[PDB]
Amino acid sequence: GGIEVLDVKTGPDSTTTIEAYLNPRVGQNWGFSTEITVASNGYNDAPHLTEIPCYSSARISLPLLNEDITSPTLLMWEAVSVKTEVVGISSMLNMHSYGLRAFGGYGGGYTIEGSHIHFFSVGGEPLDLQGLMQNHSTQYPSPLVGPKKPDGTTDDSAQVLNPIYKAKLDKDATYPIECWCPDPSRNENSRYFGSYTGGVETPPVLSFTNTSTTILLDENGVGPLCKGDGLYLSSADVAGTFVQQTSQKQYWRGLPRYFNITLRKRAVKN
Amino acid sequence: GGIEVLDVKTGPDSTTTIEAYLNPRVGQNWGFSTEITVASNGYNDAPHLTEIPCYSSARISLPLLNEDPTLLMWEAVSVKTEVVGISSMLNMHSYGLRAFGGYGGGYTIEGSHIHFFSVGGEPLDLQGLMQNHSTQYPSPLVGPKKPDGTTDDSAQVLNPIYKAKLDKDATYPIECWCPDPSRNENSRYFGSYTGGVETPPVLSFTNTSTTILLDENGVGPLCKGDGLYLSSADVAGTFVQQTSQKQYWRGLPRYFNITLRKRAVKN
Amino acid sequence: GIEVLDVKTGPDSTTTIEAYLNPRVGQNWGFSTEITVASNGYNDAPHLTEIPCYSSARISLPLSPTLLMWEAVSVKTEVVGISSMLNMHSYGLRAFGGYGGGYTIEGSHIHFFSVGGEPLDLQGLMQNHSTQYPSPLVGPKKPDGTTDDSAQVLNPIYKAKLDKDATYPIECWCPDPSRNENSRYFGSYTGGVETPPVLSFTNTSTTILLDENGVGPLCKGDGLYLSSADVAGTFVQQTSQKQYWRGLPRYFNITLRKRAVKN
Amino acid sequence: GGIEVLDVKTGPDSTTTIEAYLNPRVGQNWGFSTEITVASNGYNDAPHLTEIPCYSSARISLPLLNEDITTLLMWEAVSVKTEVVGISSMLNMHSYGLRAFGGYGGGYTIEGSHIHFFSVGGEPLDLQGLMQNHSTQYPSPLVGPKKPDGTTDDSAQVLNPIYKAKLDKDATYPIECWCPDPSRNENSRYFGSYTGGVETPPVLSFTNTSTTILLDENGVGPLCKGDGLYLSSADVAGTFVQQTSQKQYWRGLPRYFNITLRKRAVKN
Amino acid sequence: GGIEVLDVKTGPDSTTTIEAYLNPRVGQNWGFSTEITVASNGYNDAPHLTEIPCYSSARISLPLLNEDITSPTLLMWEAVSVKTEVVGISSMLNMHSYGLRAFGGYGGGYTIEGSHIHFFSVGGEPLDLQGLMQNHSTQYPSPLVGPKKPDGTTDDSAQVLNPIYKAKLDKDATYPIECWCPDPSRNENSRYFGSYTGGVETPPVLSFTNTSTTILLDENGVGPLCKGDGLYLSSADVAGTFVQQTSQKQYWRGLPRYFNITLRKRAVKN
Ligand SMILES: [Cl-]
Ligand SMILES: [Cl-]
Ligand SMILES: [Cl-]
Ligand SMILES: [Cl-]
Ligand SMILES: [Cl-]
Ligand SMILES: [Cl-]
Ligand SMILES: [Cl-]
Ligand SMILES: [Cl-]
Ligand SMILES: [Cl-]
Ligand SMILES: [Cl-]
Ligand SMILES: [Cl-]
Ligand SMILES: [Cl-]
Ligand SMILES: [Cl-]
């Protein structure tokens, strides 16, 4: 960030690893939303709290570094690398748990399918969010938070980029995926990675391995610096929809994300 | 360009970064076109101004250089670029045509899409090519015309007579203008089109990705008149409305983060 | 959590082991029995013979303040019998209104293998917490025998070791990314109703099992742990229009070297 | 070719770049074929001249080389920047396409089976005969695989060396009966990709930042015999599906070439 | 593999290149099978000879090396590299040759589509085949060869891996693709490469170029050593099915494969 970055402290107990998971927040806590609803044209677009998928977020507490915050050089934890995994991909190989049945009702149940998003960020502070949504008029129930101008309104500009609509991902299960994307004009002290696929019946493609590592160092060899000795993890893994037999109703299906972050002590001015 | 390129000036205040965004121009300003129309066979192909998606374009003003013993020009070295609001499409409740015979959720944006951006030291060079030479574009849109005002059958293939400079936002339709590969020496452009009726869009986003703008000889776009030229075209697909079963083009904005350095040139 | 020393690097210091794991899709001859779907509000209690499981085996390897353990360095692995799917005459649901050939295997599929120095660590996660697995299958249970709603997401209480072939259902158990320090695992799932399988085969491909520090899986008790899950898709039978899981076998060729460790 | 290749001449005026385009030859000249026809079973397979897509080809004239009294020099094609022009033309759902969502939606963008292919060569591209239906009747002036006697037997559906030709005329050799001959083309570099299916979506990229090296395993590029550069193209993006008629038309796209050549010394 | 490999002989006439093609063997010789048939449930699965696609195979005769077979060091040809191409991909851009017509009969004919396999091997001996098939009970007409135990039977194990079912690809147009895969437990002296795609109407994707070369040398820099001065080529290129208009019957469509192999003389202990 806008800190002056100095030498990497090295030695034993200059590096630590944190293991964490984020369970999905698809509108309920057990990995499925309630049924997806669609207001009739000309009616209010006011979906149920429990059908709006949100970003998962957590701040992990790191070991205290500076006894005096007033020393003229500080130590901050620097996130160097992350091993991350989407847990329970194998759970989707299930054609018997009440899925809409293929081949005119004689086949097995539909495995999870439809539009999906997979996304994670590691950061030294809350992730910066830019407001952008499909329908400016959408009404999010409390306690969810959506793009608002200072006056409380939400005009047509919220369907494109208007800098007036910004927020910090500072609470789990609160910021809907559908009205908030990572702000590419900020997040200097965060690394984020996302992939969205659309379509009605699109098959999800997900891989898993313990052999994959992502470097979090930027073009200048600096990783996220954890302000207040706090590591900020964010997740969004909506694998697709579950299509229920007989009802033919659709439910968002979320998956949890494992994190394994490596950090090292780093010196900064002030 | 047709300038003689010399040494990279280095020192304090020899590099700068510019941040910009281009909002989409899909025919209106709030990211959706009006309904897509299709003339009956034998009728004029004359679509509405507000249903024709166009290239977004802007010229960013750079610091003045040769105010103050060699000639200097800004050289665009790299760009971090992002399509903003991809997450907006994970929305199955905002009036989309409903799946599984009307009992399921609304269709997320789908269909044919184009994603494209250019960084340049001058206006982007456009070659005329369109699906239907007879198409009638309402004013103020601009489409391929010969000098006499006509548009013959050759405009469906390559005819060098049909050329233009992308010199105005929301004006040049994506469907009749492509980047001219015979020119654009002083511009770097990147585009991907996918077709199909219900094709799912696939879009990624990260702040960890950089594109080098230097050519085979280590030279980036040189900003003539101290002006950086950005262009965008991000039509994510169509929105399919429930009940009407009408289709609307859906555009997305594009963030740019360009790094430039001072470069010396002879005339 | 061992202290790893020098690679012993002399005569009789390397060996290669060949093995195959046949699939465990619910029966032993590469097809499950018909996939069943309880009516809404009825118990989700599928047949033993319709639940695909992880294949697993422990290969026995050759038999002081410094010890020698076998270190798995590399693996050549292959999914055998991919060519078996080019078959449009063996009773498949027929295309083009019954006049065409039978459907080749299609639908949702998973391909997965692990090489390890100990049993593969499994985390419990399933689509439906209420699912009832017949004996002798094992599914996520708390210590008290219950299985609450948390088993649809990550709850650390639901863990197991892949210590028996044809026993742990693919659908309620994934590799635990919080453990498996001494195992290398690789998996790819594709969903969809009629999704075409895409599978490649060659004897020219090798996977390195060494980690970021050049250490491979260390075989505790002189035992190499292999695991497999290759559900190619479903077979769609003509007339019945019923679906059967189709499994494929996996060949392993592992190279190991002697490695020195403290204790 | 069967020349002995020597040193790369370097100096002033030892390299040049040529710009060219090939417009598509899908059966007419304005980027669409006439309607695709399908004979009834048992009837002759005799499609219209104007519904058979062909290879585009051109020979560009290079500067004359052996004229100075001071080794003999041929132009060597080193690299090519190539682009499919007018990909953006396909983002069009208003020009009479079969309409989606039961007639209330927009027109179908181009879709279906497609082929994208280009070659750079020092001589005409070598073609091997292979076709789906040996009995197909190509109208004059099109050329299809024939034995010396004029016949075309069942072997033309697989590889029979008897069926060979040189791509020596634009808009003449149908894509469907001629592929690049991998047993020849020593002095040509070719690159092709075909995708099938009824409604398959075309995926096409465009950029001015991409270069293809034309040098072989021995660092030799195509050597332009008679000071002539041979370009070939085949860009059938897919079909246009017309509303109401529900008839299909092949849609071709033009291909830009930017070739870099250098002088190269050869012995007889 | 199995020979003591010594120095690479170098000199004039120490390298040679062979050009060959394998025409497809989809059940007839002109690139199409007869109609695909499907026995009714409970009836014998006994398809026609001319509807079963098989591996193409050929042994190319190489120049004689050893005048005395009794010399204590021999020369064998070593296959170093291969340029290989699937010929006639462009043949599929054909919507007028009697294909089932799109858009309710008013459109053009279906181009070849459906499940496909592309595969080639270069070897110093016949390719090793492992028996595995979808239906153990399938009855292959003479002269085709399918997995049999020594006693003549074919039990349920032939649907998975049973080492008892092995064969050498020693005859063209004889070993069905559907019951035989390359044996990964053998083929030490062969290099093989295969890709299968399934589905009913799956579009084939095939590329062609004269600029692509595959190295055949193993992890120890040894290529296939041609026993008896014979190079073994194998091919399987079933591009998909042809769907005929009116009949709505399906025919396997095969394509030929070009080979260009480079070999060098190599010394071995004897
Ligand atoms: Cl609207
Ligand atoms: Cl079908
Ligand atoms: Cl469920
Ligand atoms: Cl895999
Ligand atoms: Cl069965
Ligand atoms: Cl016929
Ligand atoms: Cl290409
Ligand atoms: Cl290329
Ligand atoms: Cl037309
Ligand atoms: Cl030949
Ligand atoms: Cl035919
Ligand atoms: Cl291949
Ligand atoms: Cl036929």
3-state secondary structure of C224: strand
The single-letter code of the amino acid at C183 is: S
**Lookup: tokens for B75:** 């050289």
Length of chain E: 270
d(CA C153, CA A98): 18
- Domains of chain C (ranges plus CATH)? 3-262 (2.60.175.10)
C121 touches chain A (CB under 8 A): no
Asked if B201 and B113 count as a contact pair (C-beta separation under 8 A), the reply is: yes
d(CA D230, CA D221): 13
Helix (H) or strand (E) holding B61: strand B56-61
**Lookup: tokens for D71:** 């080794």
Asked if E200 and C233 count as a contact pair (C-beta separation under 8 A), the reply is: no
d(CA C153, CA C147): 12
The single-letter code of the amino acid at A20 is: A
Residues of chain E found within 8 Å of residue C240, distances taken between Cβ atoms: 41
Q: How many CA atoms does the CB half-sphere of D262 hold within 13 Å?
A: 14
d(CA C25, CA A161): 50
**Lookup: tokens for E257:** 């494969």
Subunits adjacent to chain B (3 or more Cβ pairs under 8 Å): A, D
Which residue(s) pair with E254 in the sheet? E238
Going from the C-alpha of B127 to that of each of A42, B174, C167, D116, the distances in angstroms are 43, 11, 64, 20
Instruction: List the one residue out of C77, C75, C160, C86 whose CA is nearest residue C123.
Output: C160
CB contact under 8 A, B253 and A160: yes
B186 touches chain D (CB under 8 A): no
Distance from the A32 Cα atom to the nearest Cα atom in chain C, whole angstroms: 8
**Lookup: tokens for A90:** 């194998």
Asked if E242 and C88 count as a contact pair (C-beta separation under 8 A), the reply is: no
> Among C48, C73, C154, C238, which would you mutate to test the A interface (most chain A Cβ atoms within 10 Å of its Cβ)?
C154
d(CA B89, CA A34): 19
Asked if D98 and E103 count as a contact pair (C-beta separation under 8 A), the reply is: yes
Q: State which approach was used to obtain the coordinates.
A: X-ray
Going from the C-alpha of D174 to that of each of C60, D46, D136, the distances in angstroms are 63, 13, 11
Asked if B6 and B264 count as a contact pair (C-beta separation under 8 A), the reply is: yes
Task: Assign residue E3 a region (left: φ > 0; alpha: ψ between -120 and 50; beta: otherwise).
Answer: beta
DSSP for D151-220, written as a single string: ---GGGGS--TT-EEE--STTTSBTTTEEE-TTS-TTEEEEEEEE--SSPPPEEEEESS--EE---TTSP
C-alpha torsion sign, points A183, A188, A190, A191: positive
d(CA C92, CA C239): 9
Contacts with A, C 54-113, CB within 8 Å:
93, 107-108, 110, 112
d(CA A120, CA A87): 13
- The resolution in angstroms reads 2.6
Taking the CB of residue D62, how many other CB atoms lie within 10 A of it? 18
Q: Which residue has the tokens 């008679």?
A: D226
Contacts with B, A 130-149, CB within 8 Å:
130, 132-136, 138
Q: Name residues with Cβ closer than 5 Å to ligand 7, which is an ion.
A: D 191
CA E232 to chain centre: 11
d(CA C140, CA A173): 26
A38 touches chain B (CB under 8 A): yes
Subunits adjacent to chain A (3 or more Cβ pairs under 8 Å): B, C
d(CA E88, CA D178): 7
Per-position b or e across E93-126, b if 16+ CB within 10 A of its CB = bbbbbbbbbbbeebbbbbbbbbbbbbbbbbbbbb
Instruction: List the one residue out of C97, C94, C153 whose CA is nearest residue C123.
Output: C153
In terms of C-beta density within 10 A (0-12 exposed, 13-18 middle, 19 or more buried), how is residue E17 classed? exposed
Task: Assign residue C97 a region (left: φ > 0; alpha: ψ between -120 and 50; beta: otherwise).
Answer: left
C196 touches chain E (CB under 8 A): yes
3-state secondary structure of B171: coil
d(CA E219, CA A117): 40
**Lookup: tokens for A206:** 């997900």
CB contact under 8 A, B255 and A161: yes
**Ligand 3 mean position, distance from CA A97 (Å):** 5
CA E230 to chain centre: 17
CA E31 to chain centre: 14
> Can the peptide bond before residue D141 be classed as cis, meaning omega within 30 degrees of 0?
yes
Asked if B233 and B250 count as a contact pair (C-beta separation under 8 A), the reply is: no
d(CA B89, CA C118): 44
In terms of C-beta density within 10 A (0-12 exposed, 13-18 middle, 19 or more buried), how is residue C249 classed? buried
Residues of chain E found within 8 Å of residue D239, distances taken between Cβ atoms: 95, 107-108
DSSP for chain E, written as a single string: --S-EEEE--STTSEEEEEEEE--BSSSSSSBPSPP----TTS-----GGG--B-EEEEEEPPP--S-TTSSEEEEEEEEEEEEEETTGGGG--SSSSBPBSTTTTSPBPPSBS-EEEEEEEESSPEEEEE--S-TT--PPTT------TTS---GGGGS--TT-EEEE-STTTSBTTTEEE-TTS-TTEEEEEEEE--SSPPPEEEEESS--EE---TTSPPPB-GGGEEEEEEEEEEEEEEBTTT--EEEEE--EEEEEEEEEEEEE-
DSSP for B120-156, written as a single string: ESSPPEEEE--S-TT--PPTT------TTS---GGGG
d(CA D240, CA D236): 11
> Can the peptide bond before residue A143 be classed as cis, meaning omega within 30 degrees of 0?
yes
Q: Return the ∠ at Cα B59 (arms to B53 and B60), rounded to 5°.
A: 130
Contact exists between B and A (3 or more beta carbon pairs < 8 Å):
yes
Instruction: List the one residue out of C122, C114, C126 whose CA is nearest residue C160.
Output: C122
In terms of C-beta density within 10 A (0-12 exposed, 13-18 middle, 19 or more buried), how is residue C136 classed? exposed
C-alpha torsion sign, points B153, B157, B159, B161: positive
Distance from the B42 Cα atom to the nearest Cα atom in chain A, whole angstroms: 33
**Closest to C81 (Cβ–Cβ): which among E181, E219, E247?**
E181
**Closest to D194 (Cβ–Cβ): which among E90, E242, E244?**
E90
Q: Which residue has the tokens 């063996």?
A: C90
Asked if B26 and B235 count as a contact pair (C-beta separation under 8 A), the reply is: yes
Contacts with D, E 250-269, CB within 8 Å:
253-256, 258, 260
d(CA D29, CA B156): 9
Taking the CB of residue C103, how many other CB atoms lie within 10 A of it? 27
d(CA C188, CA A93): 11
3-state secondary structure of C48: helix
| C34 phi/psi in degrees, rounded to 5 | -55, 140
The radius of gyration of chain A's CA atoms, rounded to the nearest angstrom, is 21
Distance from the A63 Cα atom to the nearest Cα atom in chain C, whole angstroms: 21
Q: How many CA atoms does the CB half-sphere of E20 hold within 13 Å?
A: 21
Q: How many CA atoms does the CB half-sphere of C187 hold within 13 Å?
A: 31
CB contact under 8 A, B253 and A161: yes
In terms of C-beta density within 10 A (0-12 exposed, 13-18 middle, 19 or more buried), how is residue C14 classed? middle
3-state secondary structure of A92: helix
The single-letter code of the amino acid at A180 is: W
